Amino acid sequence: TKFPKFSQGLAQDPTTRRIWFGIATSHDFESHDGMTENNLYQKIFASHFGQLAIIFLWTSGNLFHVAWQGNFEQWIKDPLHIRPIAHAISDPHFGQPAIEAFTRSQFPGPVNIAYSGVYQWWYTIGLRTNVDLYNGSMFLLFIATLALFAGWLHLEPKYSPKVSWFKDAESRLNHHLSALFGLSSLAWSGHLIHVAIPESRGIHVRWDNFLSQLPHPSGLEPFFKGNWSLYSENPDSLTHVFGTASGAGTAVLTFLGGFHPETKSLWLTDIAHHHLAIAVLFIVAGHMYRTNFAIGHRIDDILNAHKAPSGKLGLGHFGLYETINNSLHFQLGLALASLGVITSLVAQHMYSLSPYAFLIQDRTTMAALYTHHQYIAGFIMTGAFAHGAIFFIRDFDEEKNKGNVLSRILDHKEAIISHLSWVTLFLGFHTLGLYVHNDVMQAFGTPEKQILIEPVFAQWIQSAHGKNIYELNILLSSDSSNAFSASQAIWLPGWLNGINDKSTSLFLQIGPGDFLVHHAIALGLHTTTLILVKGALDARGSRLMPDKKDFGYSFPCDGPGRGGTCDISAWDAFYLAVFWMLNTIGWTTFYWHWKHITLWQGNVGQFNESSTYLMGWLRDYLWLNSSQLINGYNPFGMNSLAVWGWMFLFGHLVWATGFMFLISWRGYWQELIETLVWAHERTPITNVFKWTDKPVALSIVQARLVGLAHFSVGYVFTYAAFLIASTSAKF
Amino acid sequence: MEITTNQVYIALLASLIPAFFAFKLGKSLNQ
Amino acid sequence: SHSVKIYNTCIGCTQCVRACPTDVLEMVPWDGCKAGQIASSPRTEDCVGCKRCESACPTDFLSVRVYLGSETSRSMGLAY
Amino acid sequence: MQSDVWGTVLANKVSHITGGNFSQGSLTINGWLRDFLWAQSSQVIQSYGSPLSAYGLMFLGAHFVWAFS
Amino acid sequence: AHAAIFMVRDYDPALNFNNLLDRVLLHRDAIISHLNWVCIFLGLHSFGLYIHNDTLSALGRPQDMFSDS
Amino acid sequence: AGPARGSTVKVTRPESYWYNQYGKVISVDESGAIRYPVVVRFEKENYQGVTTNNFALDELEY
Amino acid sequence: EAILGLTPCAESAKFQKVLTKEVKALEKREKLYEPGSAPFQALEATKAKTQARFAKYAESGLLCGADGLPHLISDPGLAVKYGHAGETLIPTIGFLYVAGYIGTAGRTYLQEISTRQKPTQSEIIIDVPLATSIAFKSWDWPNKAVKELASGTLLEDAKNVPVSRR
């Protein structure tokens, strides 16, 4: 018909394929009809503005709904005993008991309790009233508007940048490192020193008084003389109540380490010092590349210099600069890899060094935020490898990259894949072995014959950090070491208080159950990597198909010949790897959850005893903690867990529905749909309703994608239901 | 304290402005 | 439509031609091999994409090659 | 059978094994999951250390073989 | 399975001209399509009733359920 | 020059199943029009299940 | 010697608790039978073995956790310094000897039959004399390993190894 207008091939298709494949190729701008490099960069740049606006509108809506329908001010009076609210419910389908069930707070109606942790974050950074929130909401709506206008404007022909502007790497790196990262970090230090730290100590500072209100009793004279220490003089005491002046200090920049005793969060003056120190680093970093003033490095020169004299790396990094500068998929792959790592970092660090006031006491938000960030990191790490494969097919040219590290890595791909295959097989065999040994020992009534390997290498590292529970007396756990007795350490008393407190999750104690799961996670990381690396390294060709680059990233197969070739494309490697990634984050979040749930209830023995065999996981984790969830609605009545109950069965159903797409394949359905087309055509009256797009069965790749999407949604929705209902039921 | 019905109205009418700009940007990106 | 291409490694065994269910390929004369015939693909508007020809071909990495492309009602194998 | 036939008789009163929960409990998926799958699975998951422990091992082993498929 | 092996391997058209087996094969789109409808109908009016009950139970309206009460 | 009938060659055609492997020469064609005159036989069958293939002289190491 | 926060099983109360718990279960089962009957004798054999096993674990310098179950030490330095090398380090050497033996026997048989007329017939019908000879001559497998390594006959050269279009 007409849609999709970016593909004539698709728009001639007389079937329902046109619709589905039109939606699925709409953002792949390179493959569009008559696409030039200029037009490609300009549509990317605009879409980027569109994403920004969507993010600012999302934040604006969180602020709005919390200011309008939440209980932010009540929560501020009693953080540990009021539940924060996300939004109201306006569902005409509810009955009166459901209305009475979901009615919690003083709001007149049914609400949803929020688990995103935005209340803790807003309170920490200084907001205190619903008017604050509302004004923030309005500001963000304005910034959205600006982004959308910029998007449109830079799409106009007078402001549309040229490709050279897009390919100016050194300038971008300077600006992005000095300003985006550096000056935004310095600004945040300014916000903390001028607004947040005062509000933490009772002083109310807003736009109408900040220009007068001195953030430190001595002003900027200490700064300009060089008496910087005066800014660290009188820190808050260990008896300080957050938000009041009782026990409060005057210092604005410290290095105390550890946590504030009431909030169980990091000190704000250490967060301000942090943001200020790294600002100084990023600003210095952003003055390194050569732009328009003759000073600075050129990136190609750095690249071209680094080559080992032995020749073990070949021609080293020669030619890489044009490779990366001319390939968007390389750039996207490197970005997603980096972001992947940083997202896991945020998950691993926010539970152990909690930065927000009263957030560790909110157990369900803690569990939600860890789970959320690790699932996102998992999806992002698959993407990085996917876009690495698409680079090897679409943008890698061997003539230009001859002898450098990319061609070399491609020249020993069998060594890489075979070694990964060894590691995978080794962990899988031994780790599943040891669990099955331990299960049979428990079943035969002989728990003393389990194999329970201590994690001594992790206990050593914990000992070096200052934990004294393993009696190993090294580095920070020895009094006599250089590391401990370093005079100007000064973060150490705070740190050691924190690391030897059972309540915090700062280096949890570990034992045999911790040893087994860490090897399971290793098995999952390696096996995911192996599937994705094989994908990217066999992308351009293999022995079973030497001309794979000519078919592209995604294609069904190469037919039943040569022994059969289902799932031989690099896209299929990605599709296979997503199951392994969900399984691996599954294992990490189950471990995090069960380990915390037992620590918070006090019975760490439960985890220590039960986690060494698989019936323990099944019985004392899944089976036991599903009791309240599945009673959310019963023949007797219903409670506010009825929504999570229903979303739990919904997840089960969506996961199972995905198996239909994953197991039954296309021909079955194409032959059934032919009989339905016959029945429609031959049934009187009804025939007069004619289709415009001939009904056909979904395609081969399409159904792999639809199966994966049903599988992923059901996996996520089930676990999130279980995680929130179980944690919220018991805490 | 409680956000008033007036402040909801102002929020709505304000939101009409990035709706228009959205439409504009969409149309522009769509060839 | 799908695109069927023939490369010069053909040995003129006629097996692909025999295999094809929609008469896309035929044998034309050639001098590059002992059999003095090569395969050719004049009627690629009738190719359904089954890849039966590639299963028949006995040369090491096939001399006939089907690259799937845009769908039509003919290539989609529709009797409606 | 466990809810409506099998049980023990005292005089004329019949005390069934799951106490007649089929008639009401079977009318939702949640009830099949809760009153059948979750509740009646207590015996097999609490079988370790007993003479029924082979059923516990076969229960986990079969979950494994199914997922392997 | 074995019926399909018979059709593929041991069916002779010549010896089955206008008998029952041939007539079956002349209306095989009508047989499958009617079976298809019956399956959709039974699916919706049977598992749809459990989904009904689950949903109305969760919405707090047990008097709207397909039940003995 | 051609290999002798019965000699051993090593394939150097990268898209072939038998790359870097050794085969026996069965026949050489002498016409110049022929594009792949040498017939080689291998012990290991390929994915297609065949064990023989025609090669050019610039794809063999003899 | 108590290391890593663990107590020795010989002087752990939780260890004894576990032994009590197993023996008590066996006593309960014995109540049902008659003191002379053969089930009774079976349960006594079971209980004997059990007490023997705990005694063995007690005089082996095994280290118990808070659960009262023995824990193994796998860093070789810690194992050797505190007398726990029999838990993982000796078994390592023992596994690596037997795995090297099996590998060597398999590689040997494969390299031997590869020179036959139809080598693939000797893979589905095993040459049993040849296999027994190889199995028994391969007890000194590091001889062959270090010879092959140092000489260069272990690895095929890259030019002779089939590989894809890379």
Ligand code: CLA
């Ligand atoms: C951006 C995310 C966002 C989300 C997910 C929601 C979600 C919701 N809003 Mg809220 N809303 C938002 C922003 C958002 N809002 C903002 C910024 C304002 C201030 C202008 C409001 C003002 C508002 C009012 C007055 C009401 C709601 C209501 C609701 C609820 C029902 C849907 C509805 O009636 O809204 C209707 C939508 C609007 C009134 C304007 C929304 C403007 C946003 C930016 C929409 C665009 C979203 C996004 C960018 C589109 C991309 C998706 C696409 C990729 C598929 C639902 C929870 C109703 C409610 O509270 O029920 C209990 C209700 O009465 N919202």
Ligand code: CLA
């Ligand atoms: C910044 C991040 C980023 C960017 C800019 C891109 C950009 C792109 N990707 Mg990459 N990718 C990324 C991250 C990113 N990706 C990540 C994180 C992954 C791992 C998931 C991938 C994996 C990936 C694959 C495997 C492929 C791409 C492809 C592409 C290209 C086309 C995509 C397309 O046509 O979409 C249009 C697609 C859609 C409209 C489908 C949407 C499917 C939805 C999101 C499923 C969600 C389920 C459901 C709706 C949930 C609802 C809740 C429920 C209760 C109802 C485009 C260049 C493709 C390409 O063509 O290269 C050749 C390609 O094949 N990407």
Ligand code: CLA
């Ligand atoms: C429980 C389910 C399950 C299990 C056990 C496996 C196991 C494995 N997967 Mg598979 N996989 C699965 C689900 C599973 N997968 C699913 C759902 C998908 C998505 C389609 C995949 C997709 C997938 C891909 C793409 C890849 C794997 C690979 C692997 C191998 C990784 C090697 C290893 O980790 O340990 C070693 C082996 C095991 C732990 C399993 C062996 C089982 C026991 C230990 C063997 C002993 C049997 C015993 C003697 C009894 C004999 C039977 C008797 C009747 C005769 C391993 C064989 C990878 C691989 O092969 O890398 C080499 C690989 O690339 N998997």
Ligand code: CLA
């Ligand atoms: C839970 C997992 C799941 C589900 C829901 C389905 C569903 C279906 N399968 Mg699939 N299938 C599955 C797993 C599943 N399958 C698996 C694992 C495989 C093995 C690979 C298959 C292999 C398979 C084959 C080979 C066939 C089916 C067929 C069917 C269809 C049966 C007809 C039917 O009952 O439609 C009715 C739809 C349902 C019962 C789905 C749920 C619909 C809900 C209850 C209604 C949705 C709400 C709706 C909006 C409410 C409207 C009314 C209300 C307002 C009053 C149905 C769509 C058959 C088919 O298509 O024949 C016609 C068929 O031949 N399936």
Ligand code: CLA
């Ligand atoms: C002579 C027999 C032999 C030898 C010496 C090797 C050696 C090796 N294998 Mg191989 N392998 C073998 C048989 C052998 N394998 C067989 C029979 C299979 C099919 C199951 C495999 C499947 C296999 C896979 C999938 C992988 C290896 C890998 C490896 C390498 C690393 C070690 C390892 O992963 O062990 C693991 C070994 C197994 C999983 C197979 C068990 C081998 C049995 C126990 C011994 C041989 C049995 C044989 C019937 C003995 C008959 C001898 C008699 C007649 C005299 C190493 C080169 C890995 C690698 O590539 O490393 C880079 C790898 O991923 N092997």
Ligand SMILES: CC1=C(/C=C/C(C)=C/C=C/C(C)=C/C=C/C=C(C)/C=C/C=C(C)/C=C/C2=C(C)CCCC2(C)C)C(C)(C)CCC1
């Ligand atoms: C008149 C009036 C009123 C009312 C109003 C209203 C009713 C409103 C509404 C409103 C609304 C209803 C709004 C909305 C909004 C929306 C928005 C704001 C959106 C956005 C979006 C976006 C941004 C998107 C994006 C995109 C996409 C998705 C694709 C591509 C393109 C783009 C990127 C653009 C009142 C009563 C007050 C008063 C009186 C007057």
Ligand SMILES: CC1=C(/C=C/C(C)=C/C=C/C(C)=C/C=C/C=C(C)/C=C/C=C(C)/C=C/C2=C(C)CCCC2(C)C)C(C)(C)CCC1
């Ligand atoms: C395929 C492909 C691709 C992709 C890629 C990827 C996907 C990757 C990933 C990767 C990754 C994702 C990685 C990671 C890494 C990391 C690291 C390497 C780290 C390190 C660290 C360190 C070493 C540290 C240190 C330390 C510690 C540990 C502690 C203490 C302190 C300190 C600091 C000293 C691309 C795009 C290129 C393109 C082509 C193709």
